[PDB]
PDB file of C-alpha atoms and ligand atoms in Angstrom:
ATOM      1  CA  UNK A   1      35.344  59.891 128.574  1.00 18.91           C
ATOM      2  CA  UNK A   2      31.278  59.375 129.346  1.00 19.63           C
ATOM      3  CA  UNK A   3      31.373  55.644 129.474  1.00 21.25           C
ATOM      4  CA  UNK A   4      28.140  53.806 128.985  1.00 20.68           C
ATOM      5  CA  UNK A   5      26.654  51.672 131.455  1.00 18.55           C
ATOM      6  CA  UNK A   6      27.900  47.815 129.992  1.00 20.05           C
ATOM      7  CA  UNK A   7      30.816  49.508 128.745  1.00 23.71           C
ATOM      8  CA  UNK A   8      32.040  50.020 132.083  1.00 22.30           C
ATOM      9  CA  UNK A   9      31.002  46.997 133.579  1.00 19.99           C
ATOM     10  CA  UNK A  10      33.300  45.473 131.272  1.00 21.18           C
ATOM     11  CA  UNK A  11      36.405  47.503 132.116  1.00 20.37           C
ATOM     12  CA  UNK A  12      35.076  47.005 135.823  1.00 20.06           C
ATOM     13  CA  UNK A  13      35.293  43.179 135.128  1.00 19.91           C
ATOM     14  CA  UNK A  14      38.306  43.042 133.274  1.00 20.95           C
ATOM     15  CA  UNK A  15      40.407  45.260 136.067  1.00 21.17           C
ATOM     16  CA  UNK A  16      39.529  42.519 138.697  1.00 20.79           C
ATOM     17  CA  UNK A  17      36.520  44.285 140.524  1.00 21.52           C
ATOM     18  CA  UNK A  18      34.035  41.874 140.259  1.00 21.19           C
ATOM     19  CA  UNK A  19      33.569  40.214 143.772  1.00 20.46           C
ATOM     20  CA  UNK A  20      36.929  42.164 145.149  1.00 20.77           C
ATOM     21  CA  UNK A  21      36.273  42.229 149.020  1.00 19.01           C
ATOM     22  CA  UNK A  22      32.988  40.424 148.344  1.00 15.38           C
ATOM     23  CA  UNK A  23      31.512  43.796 146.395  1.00 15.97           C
ATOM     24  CA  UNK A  24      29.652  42.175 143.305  1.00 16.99           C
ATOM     25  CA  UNK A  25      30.503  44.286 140.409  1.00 16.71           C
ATOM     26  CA  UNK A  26      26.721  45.864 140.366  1.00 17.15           C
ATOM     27  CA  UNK A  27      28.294  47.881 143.747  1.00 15.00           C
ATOM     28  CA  UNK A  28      31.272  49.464 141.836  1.00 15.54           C
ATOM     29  CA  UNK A  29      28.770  49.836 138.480  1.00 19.50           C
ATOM     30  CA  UNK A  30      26.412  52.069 141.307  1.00 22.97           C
ATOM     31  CA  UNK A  31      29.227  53.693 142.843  1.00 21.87           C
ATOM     32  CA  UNK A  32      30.316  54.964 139.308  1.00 24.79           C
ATOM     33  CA  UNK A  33      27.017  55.642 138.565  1.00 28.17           C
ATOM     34  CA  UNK A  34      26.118  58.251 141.486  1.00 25.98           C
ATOM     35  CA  UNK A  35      29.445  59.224 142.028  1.00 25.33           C
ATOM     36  CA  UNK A  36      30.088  60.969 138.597  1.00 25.06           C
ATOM     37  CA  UNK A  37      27.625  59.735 136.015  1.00 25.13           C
ATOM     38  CA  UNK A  38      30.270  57.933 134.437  1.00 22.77           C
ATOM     39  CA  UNK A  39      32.071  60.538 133.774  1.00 21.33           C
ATOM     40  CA  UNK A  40      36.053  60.447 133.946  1.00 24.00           C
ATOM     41  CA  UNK A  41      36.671  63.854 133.966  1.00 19.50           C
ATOM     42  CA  UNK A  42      34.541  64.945 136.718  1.00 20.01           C
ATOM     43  CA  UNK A  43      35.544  66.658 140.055  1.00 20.49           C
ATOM     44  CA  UNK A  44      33.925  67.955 143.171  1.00 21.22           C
ATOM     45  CA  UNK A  45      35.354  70.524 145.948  1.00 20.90           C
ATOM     46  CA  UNK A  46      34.801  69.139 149.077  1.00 21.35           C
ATOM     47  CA  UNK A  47      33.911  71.807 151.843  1.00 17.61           C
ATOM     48  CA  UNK A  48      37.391  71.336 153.444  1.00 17.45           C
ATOM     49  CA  UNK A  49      39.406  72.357 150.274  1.00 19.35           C
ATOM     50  CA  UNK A  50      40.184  68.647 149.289  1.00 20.51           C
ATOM     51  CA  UNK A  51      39.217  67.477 145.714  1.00 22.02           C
ATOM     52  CA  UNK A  52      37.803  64.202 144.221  1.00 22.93           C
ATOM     53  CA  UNK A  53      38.554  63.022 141.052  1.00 20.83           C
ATOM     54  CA  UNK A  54      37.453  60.940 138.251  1.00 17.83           C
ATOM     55  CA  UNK A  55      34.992  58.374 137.897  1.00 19.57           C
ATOM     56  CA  UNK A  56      35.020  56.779 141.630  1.00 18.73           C
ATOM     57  CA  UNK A  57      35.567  60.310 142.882  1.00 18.07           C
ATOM     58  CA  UNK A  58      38.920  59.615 145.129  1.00 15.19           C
ATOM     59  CA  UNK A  59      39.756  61.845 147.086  1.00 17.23           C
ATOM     60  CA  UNK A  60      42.823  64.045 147.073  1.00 16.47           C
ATOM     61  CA  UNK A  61      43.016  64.465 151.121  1.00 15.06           C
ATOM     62  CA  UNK A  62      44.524  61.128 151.483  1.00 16.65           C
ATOM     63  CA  UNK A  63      44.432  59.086 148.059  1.00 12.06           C
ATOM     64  CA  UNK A  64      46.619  61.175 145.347  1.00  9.76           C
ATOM     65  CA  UNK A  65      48.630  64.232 144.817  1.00  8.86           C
ATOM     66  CA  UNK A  66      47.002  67.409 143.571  1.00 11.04           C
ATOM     67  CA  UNK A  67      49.410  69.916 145.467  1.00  8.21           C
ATOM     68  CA  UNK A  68      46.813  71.959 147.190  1.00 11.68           C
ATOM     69  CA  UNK A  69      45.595  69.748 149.882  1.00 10.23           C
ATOM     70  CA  UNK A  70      47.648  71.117 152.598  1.00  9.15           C
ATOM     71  CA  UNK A  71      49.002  68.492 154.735  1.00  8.30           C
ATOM     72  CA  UNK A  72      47.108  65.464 152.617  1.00 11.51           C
ATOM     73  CA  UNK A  73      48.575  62.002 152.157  1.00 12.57           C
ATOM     74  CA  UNK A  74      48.903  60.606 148.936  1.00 11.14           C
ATOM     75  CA  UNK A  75      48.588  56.961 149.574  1.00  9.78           C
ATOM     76  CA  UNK A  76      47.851  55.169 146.271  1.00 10.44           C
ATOM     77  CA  UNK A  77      51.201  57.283 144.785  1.00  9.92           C
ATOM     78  CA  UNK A  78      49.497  58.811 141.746  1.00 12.08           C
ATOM     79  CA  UNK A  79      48.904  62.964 140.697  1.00 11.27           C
ATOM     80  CA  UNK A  80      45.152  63.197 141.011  1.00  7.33           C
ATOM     81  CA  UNK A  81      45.090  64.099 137.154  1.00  5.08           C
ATOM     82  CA  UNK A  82      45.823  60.438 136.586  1.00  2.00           C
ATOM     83  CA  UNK A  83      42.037  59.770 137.910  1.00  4.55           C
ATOM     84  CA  UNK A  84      40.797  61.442 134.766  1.00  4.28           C
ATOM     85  CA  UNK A  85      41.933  59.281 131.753  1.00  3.47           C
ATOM     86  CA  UNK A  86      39.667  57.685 129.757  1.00  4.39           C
ATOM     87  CA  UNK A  87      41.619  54.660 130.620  1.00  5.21           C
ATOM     88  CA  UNK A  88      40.612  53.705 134.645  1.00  4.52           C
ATOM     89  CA  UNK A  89      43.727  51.355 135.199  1.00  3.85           C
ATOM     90  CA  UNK A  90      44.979  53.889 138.132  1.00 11.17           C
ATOM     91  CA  UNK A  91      41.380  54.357 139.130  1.00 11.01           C
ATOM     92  CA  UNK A  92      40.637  50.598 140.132  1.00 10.66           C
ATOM     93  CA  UNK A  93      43.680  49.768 141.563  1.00 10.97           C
ATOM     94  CA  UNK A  94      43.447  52.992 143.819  1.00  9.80           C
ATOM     95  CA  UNK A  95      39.725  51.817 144.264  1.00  9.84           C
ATOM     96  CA  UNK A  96      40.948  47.934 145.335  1.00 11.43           C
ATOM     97  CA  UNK A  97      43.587  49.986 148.253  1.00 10.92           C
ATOM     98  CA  UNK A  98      40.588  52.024 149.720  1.00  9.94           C
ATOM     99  CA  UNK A  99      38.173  49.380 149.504  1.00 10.39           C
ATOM    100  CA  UNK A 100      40.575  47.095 151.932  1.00  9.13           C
ATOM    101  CA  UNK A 101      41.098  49.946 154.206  1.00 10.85           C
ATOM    102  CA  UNK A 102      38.484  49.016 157.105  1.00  8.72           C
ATOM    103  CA  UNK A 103      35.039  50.305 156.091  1.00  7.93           C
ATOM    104  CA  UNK A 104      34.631  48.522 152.736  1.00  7.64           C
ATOM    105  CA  UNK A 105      32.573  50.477 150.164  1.00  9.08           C
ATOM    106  CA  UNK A 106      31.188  52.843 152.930  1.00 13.52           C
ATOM    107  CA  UNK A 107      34.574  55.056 152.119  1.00 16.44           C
ATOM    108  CA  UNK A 108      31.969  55.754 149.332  1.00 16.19           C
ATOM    109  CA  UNK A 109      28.914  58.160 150.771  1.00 14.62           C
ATOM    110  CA  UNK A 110      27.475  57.852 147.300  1.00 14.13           C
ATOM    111  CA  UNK A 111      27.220  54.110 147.371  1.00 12.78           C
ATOM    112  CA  UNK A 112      25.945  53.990 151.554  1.00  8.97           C
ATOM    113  CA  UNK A 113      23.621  56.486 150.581  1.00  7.45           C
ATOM    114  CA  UNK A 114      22.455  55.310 147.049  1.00  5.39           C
ATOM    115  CA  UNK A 115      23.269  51.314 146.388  1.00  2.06           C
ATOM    116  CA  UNK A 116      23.913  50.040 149.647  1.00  2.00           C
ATOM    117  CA  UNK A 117      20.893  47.704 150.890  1.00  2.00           C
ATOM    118  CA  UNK A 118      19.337  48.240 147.096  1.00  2.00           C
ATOM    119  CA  UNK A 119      19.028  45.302 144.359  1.00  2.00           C
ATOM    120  CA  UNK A 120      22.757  46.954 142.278  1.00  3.02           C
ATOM    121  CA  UNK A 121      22.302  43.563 139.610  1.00  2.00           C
ATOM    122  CA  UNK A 122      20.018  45.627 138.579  1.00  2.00           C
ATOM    123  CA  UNK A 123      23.025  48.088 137.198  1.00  2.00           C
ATOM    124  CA  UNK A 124      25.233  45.238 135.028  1.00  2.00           C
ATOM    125  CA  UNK A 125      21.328  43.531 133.536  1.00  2.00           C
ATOM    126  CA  UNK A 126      21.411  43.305 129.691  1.00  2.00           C
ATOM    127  CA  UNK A 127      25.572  43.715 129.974  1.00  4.58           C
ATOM    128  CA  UNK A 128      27.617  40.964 127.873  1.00  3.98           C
ATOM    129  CA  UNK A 129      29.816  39.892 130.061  1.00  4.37           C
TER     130      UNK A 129
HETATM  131 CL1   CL B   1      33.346  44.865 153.600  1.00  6.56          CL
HETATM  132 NA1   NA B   2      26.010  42.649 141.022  1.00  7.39          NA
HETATM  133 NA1   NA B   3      48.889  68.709 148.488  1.00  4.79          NA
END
């Protein structure tokens, strides 16, 4: 599923991202955003053999279970394939366990690269919400 912009902000919303760990939902909207264009079926190779999946691109070297990843972890207890439904239930809640884990939103390079320091209301303006 391509989900648009507001559209995701509400699903964002609705899942309990919104301030979680003081990230506004603009953050996670940005994330999305640069991470996969919104895009639930997207993946990436990363250069050592681990995947990421889905629309907040988690990756398969300690998040979820692809069965190629030798020696991974697969801490949020999910196949990988379950990052790509259109619905983003296991997405968020694997999002809200990596957020927690230390570094915050840094985990994404996407989001330090591309939203961090940068005006992200800008990415829920014009949303009903
Ligand atoms: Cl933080
Ligand atoms: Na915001
Ligand atoms: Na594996």
């Amino acid at each position: 599923k391509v989900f648009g912009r507001c559209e995701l902000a509400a699903a964002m919303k609705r899942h309990g991202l919104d301030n979680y760990r003081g990230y506004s939902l603009g953050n996670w909207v940005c994330a999305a955003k640069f991470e996969s264009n919104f895009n639930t079926q997207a993946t990436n190779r990363n250069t050592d053999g681990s995947t990421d999946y889905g629309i907040l691109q988690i990756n398969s070297r300690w998040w979820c279970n692809d069965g190629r990843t030798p020696g991974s972890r697969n801490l949020c207890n999910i196949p990988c394939s379950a990052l790509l439904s259109s619905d983003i239930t296991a997405s968020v809640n694997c999002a809200k366990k990596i957020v927690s884990d230390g570094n915050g939103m840094n985990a994404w390079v996407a989001w330090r690269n591309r939203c961090k320091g940068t005006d992200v209301q800008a990415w829920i303006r014009g949303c009903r919400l």
